[PDB]
Amino acid sequence: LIIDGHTHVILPVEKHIKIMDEAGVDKTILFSTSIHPETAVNLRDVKKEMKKLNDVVNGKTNSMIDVRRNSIKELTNVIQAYPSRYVGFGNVPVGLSENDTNSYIEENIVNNKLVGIGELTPASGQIKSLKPIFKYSMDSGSLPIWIHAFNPLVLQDIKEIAELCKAFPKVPVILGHMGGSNWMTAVELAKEIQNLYLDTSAYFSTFVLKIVINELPLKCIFGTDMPFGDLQLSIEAIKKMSNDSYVANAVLGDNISRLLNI
Amino acid sequence: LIIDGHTHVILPVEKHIKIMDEAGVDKTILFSTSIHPETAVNLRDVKKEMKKLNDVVNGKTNSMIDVRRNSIKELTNVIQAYPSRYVGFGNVPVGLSENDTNSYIEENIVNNKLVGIGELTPASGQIKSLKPIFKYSMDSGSLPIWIHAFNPLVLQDIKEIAELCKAFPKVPVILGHMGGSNWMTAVELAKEIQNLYLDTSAYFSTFVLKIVINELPLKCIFGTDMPFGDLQLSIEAIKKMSNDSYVANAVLGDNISRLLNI
Ligand SMILES: [Zn+2]
Ligand SMILES: [Zn+2]
Ligand SMILES: [Zn+2]
Ligand SMILES: [Zn+2]
Questions:
Q1: What residues of B are in contact with residue A206 (Cβ under 8 Å)?
Q2: Cβ separation of A229 and B206 shorter than 8 Å?
Q3: Which of B9, B1, B2 is nearest to B225 (CA)?
Q4: Which of B8, B102, B188, B256 has the most CB atoms lying inside 10 A of its own CB?
Q5: Between vectors from CA B239 to CA B5 and to CA A49, what angle results, nearest 5°?
Q6: Alpha carbon of B10 to those of A4, A242, B91, B173, B227: distances in Å?
Q7: CATH says A1-262 is which class?
Q8: Strand pairing of A173-175 and A86-90?
Q9: Sequence spans of domains, chain B
């Protein structure tokens, strides 16, 4: 009904549940994270944390295993506390072998009953390195893949993501952040490709947001990217930019409820 | 005074004055524009304008002097209609000779009584081409220079803008959009460099917005970037993210009132 389609685990968990309660939000799709800027005491510590997140988003940490496994453990432990309020996507190391990627997915995603894979943060130029994650999904239960697509991703990376969608048509793909500055191409590709959807989180223009959600009302998925975005402010923006209440309600939860079978 | 520090000319003008009125906004620093996506009815035309825009901001239109002479005439005529509500910045083509630069500025900026130069849209790697404009502003009334600093500017362009600030310490510089994904460096640079301010428009994270405005409460200038942003929405965000009402009142207008002597 309102489902936040993309938020990183927030601590203390009860503060986030209270923010959901106050915003009229039923459920959140939670994403693992190695980093908790929302708990940093003092500005120096916030910056330290934001600098580490910059490295992650830039793709410098992608082959690391243990940190992704600890963040899944955090994620499963958080969901277990509020299993009516949370569903989870778990992250998978990029740039491993097909064998090691499969076992990883089996142990850390399937065995934890997570509903999707992400948030992937490929380095620019390295989209093709995601093939084995698509392969696993093509086969075993078509888990949605969620891909960060704001900076540092450029136009050609968006195009390459599109090609993987076409090559693996049964695997749903959610494009993080509408493709950033590349939203015009992102919206064309999502119109064209059956299995490509767009996340709304981290829009930089309410006019771009208006154009994209009203052009693709059934394939845009509301998300806030907490702790980076604000739940009430983002909900308010969706409802103000939506051309009618159907569009608003589809983007705000009916689309992802349909997609994940919530 | 709440002042919108960065908005492009909106047509019809009375629509924009009404929005200001409803949002409790006293004045807007209005910036010229060659494209009007707000007057496009139907989606094909909107897309057509947004595309023309996307390559302006990317730096491809940077020598289309005719079109730009027309946009300044538009801006001067709009200002004349509500001279108590609007003050203007006028654009200057980026890559011209020192002589062709001082000629354009004299005719189009100084003669039209505009209070600043902008919004400049240098292509990535071309920040050094801006030197003539800094040189002229230094010889005229130290007119502020306002530079688009979201994509496609990268970190190195941001660093190069800072060097220009240091070479021209009396020329105020407003860094558009907090420097986008490069906001961590942008805010360090603005802390250290006397004449460098940050525009808040086109933030993509309210958390980033929060860190930046509370770290630099006296050098962040509220702007909405209409027609790309939404006045009421953006104001709400500033007030919600500000740590106190001083911070909010500075960012929302006192800062630009001081800098521009409004
Ligand atoms: Zn992301
Ligand atoms: Zn995220
Ligand atoms: Zn701009
Ligand atoms: Zn602008």
A1: 228-230, 233
A2: yes
A3: B9
A4: B256
A5: 95
A6: 33, 21, 16, 24, 7
A7: alpha beta
A8: unpaired
A9: 1-262
